């Protein structure tokens, strides 16, 4: 299980540069290569471009000027930096362990083979949103658990996310140790320009007394964590 | 440079065969690659090298690549295979190298109806003492992805401090909606409650909640 993980600062302001690692777990940088990959809102993907583990590098010509991939062998990361944003920028960015490949059609004296590329291994993203406006944490309530949201042998609980920008907020309940019956939904972008969103959990009703359950709120770019407890 | 030409969409109904292709200017000749990006989720490699499989993929998937046309094809399609699906080349020549199609919508005909699950939640004791109330509802497992939502405060409609998503798909192929309607404390205790009444395909589903 390689897995890799993207970071990023969430908001960014025009003008700036817009930084970005990737962290892979569970398998080397070496041998292997590395690309960033976009999605403005709406968009398709758009290949920024990549890194072999010994420097070497590949761009799309559309970005080129503005970007610089680099690698760092000995923390097993890389990094994207791209001057001088607008709002065109602002997007999903993605890294993907990426693989060369060489299909010898011919007679290999002849020289007469290619070669290809293709990404096998995806992050699951990191939101950057280029905006002249402030980031704001969350404010989070308990949503408790009642006689009103129960279904028989299951019940809905939850925490409430109010208030912030820009998206992202994570949830987990637990610590990460419960994922079954989670569910965070999408966002509401409210008049005020701020975002809230709610996480439920669903559990069983016989041992709502005597369970604990705990939401883990986090908004990096406003760098706000806060755990609230959810009781009946 | 090297131009890819994917559908914007394909339509099938469940249990049918979906095909997706990418043009082509002697594509037969290149090496072609196909990801899924399902709603809300991060590309997925589903082909690779024309008809190579990853490990996990579904034995449903099957790539080929001949003359001017790569085709992805997915057998017994099912909901789950909704998604946008893009071919890849890498191109040598350059200048752009590495080429994306535009992308195909996968749309599944004829899913099954599901009515929404609605849960309501009336406004936390933390968050009354911090002068503040909100209302919270939430609209989960439905099909198809339209509801409409309506407010009452007692059996008053109110318009004011509403704000509700628009409907997305959940991990189960079905949809989820939220909507939020912020009340003064005040308001709150004055009410003997207040109600979320969802409609979907014609049939409402409407919660109540009240003050303790």
């Known amino acids: 299980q390689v897995q890799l993980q993207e970071s990023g600062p969430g908001l960014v302001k025009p003008s700036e540069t817009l930084s970005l690692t990737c962290t892979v777990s569970?398998?080397?940088?070496?041998?292997?290569?590395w690309s960033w990959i976009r999605q403005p809102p709406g968009k398709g993907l758009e290949w920024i471009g990549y890194?072999?583990?010994?420097?070497?590098?590949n761009y799309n010509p559309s970005l080129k000027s503005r970007v610089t991939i680099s690698v760092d062998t000995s923390k097993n990361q890389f990094s994207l930096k791209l001057s001088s944003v607008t709002a065109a920028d602002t997007a999903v960015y993605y890294c993907?362990?990426?693989?060369?490949?060489?299909?010898?059609?011919?007679?290999?004296?002849?020289?007469?083979?290619?070669?290809?590329?293709?990404?096998?291994?995806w992050g699951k993203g990191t939101t950057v949103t280029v905006s002249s406006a402030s980031t704001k944490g969350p404010s989070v309530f308990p949503l408790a658990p009642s006689s009103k949201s129960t279904s028989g042998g299951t019940a809905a609980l939850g925490c409430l996310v109010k208030d912030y920008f820009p998206e992202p907020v994570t949830v987990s309940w637990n610590s990460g140790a419960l994922t079954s019956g989670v569910h965070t939904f999408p966002a509401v972008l409210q008049s005020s320009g701020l975002y809230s969103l709610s996480s439920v959990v669903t559990v069983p009703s016989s041992s709502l007394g005597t369970q604990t359950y705990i939401c883990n709120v986090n908004h990096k770019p406003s760098n706000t964590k806060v755990d609230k407890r959810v009781e009946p | 440079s090297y131009v890819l030409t994917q559908p914007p969409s394909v339509s099938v109904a469940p249990g049918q065969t979906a095909r997706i292709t990418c043009g082509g200017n002697?594509?037969?000749?290149?090496?072609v690659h196909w990801y899924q990006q399902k709603p809300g989720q991060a590309p997925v490699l589903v082909v690779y090298?024309?008809?190579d499989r990853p490990s996990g993929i579904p034995e449903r998937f099957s790539g080929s690549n001949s003359g001017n046309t790569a085709t992805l094809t997915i057998s017994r399609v099912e909901a789950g295979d909704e998604a946008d699906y893009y071919c890849?080349?890498?191109?040598?020549?350059?200048?752009?190298?590495?080429?994306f199609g535009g992308g195909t919508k996968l749309t599944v005909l004829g899913q099954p109806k599901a009515a929404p699950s609605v849960t309501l939640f009336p406004p936390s004791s933390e968050e009354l003492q911090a002068n503040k109330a909100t209302l919270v509802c939430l609209i989960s497992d439905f099909y198809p992805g339209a509801v409409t939502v309506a407010w009452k405060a007692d059996s008053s409609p109110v318009k004011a401090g509403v704000e509700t998503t628009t409907p997305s798909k959940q991990s189960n192929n079905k949809y989820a909606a939220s909507s939020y309607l912020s009340l003064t404390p005040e308001q709150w205790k004055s009410h003997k409650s207040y109600s979320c009444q969802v409609t979907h395909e014609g049939s409402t589903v409407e919660k109540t909640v009240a003050p303790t």
């Open positions: 090298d024309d008809s």
């Open positions: 569970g398998g080397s940088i070496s041998s292997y290569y």
């Open positions: 890194i072999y583990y010994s420097g070497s590098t």
């Open positions: 890849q080349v890498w191109d040598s020549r350059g200048p752009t190298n590495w080429v």
């Open positions: 002697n594509i037969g000749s290149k090496s």
């Open positions: 993907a362990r990426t693989l060369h490949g060489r299909r010898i059609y011919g007679i290999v004296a002849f020289k007469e083979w290619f070669t290809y590329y293709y990404m096998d291994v």
